[PDB]
C-alpha cells in the first residue's frame with residue numbers, strides 16, 4: 001500500500017505516467033482506438049494481446065512486467081443514461097479489483113466515458129464520482145490524467161473539497 005494513500009491530478013499524456021500501472025480507456029474489441037486508447041497502443045502495444053472484454057469490465061495484460069488494465073466504459077451514444085451510468089460504475093469497480101490484485105502502490109487512471117464515449121455530454125463529475133466510489137477503499141496512490149485546462153482545475157477542486 002501507499003504510506004498515505006492520495007488522489008492527484010495531472011494534465012498530460014497518460015503514456016508518460018510515473019505510476020506502477022496504467023488504466024486504458026479501452027474499447028470492447030481490444031482495437032487500437034483513438035485518444036487515450038491510441039496513446040496506450042503506441043506505448044504498450046504488447047498489452048493488446050487478448051485484451052478484448054465486455055462493457056463494464058476490466059482485463060489486465062502485462063507489457064513486460066508493467067500492468068495495463070483495459071477498462072471498458074459504456075458509449076453513451078448507445079446506452080440509455082440509466083444503463084450507461086450502471087456500466088460506468090461497474091467498470092471502475094472492476095478497476096479497483098485489478099489494482100488490489102496486482103499489489104501496486106500507485107495507478108494512473110483516465111476519466112472513463114468522458115471523450116468519444118460521452119454521447120456529447122460533459123460527464124466530468126459523473127465519471128469522477130464513480131472513480132472515487134470504487135477507488136476510495138483501495139490504498140494505492142491514484143493519479144488522474146486529463147488533457148483540458150478547465151477539467152484539470154475542476155478535478156483538482158473536487159479532490160481538495162474532500163481533504
Ligand SMILES: [Cl-]
Pocket residue numbers: 011012013016
Ligand atoms: Cl504531454
Ligand SMILES: [Cl-]
Pocket residue numbers: 025112113114115116117118
Ligand atoms: Cl471515452
Ligand SMILES: [Cl-]
Pocket residue numbers: 146147148151
Ligand atoms: Cl480532459
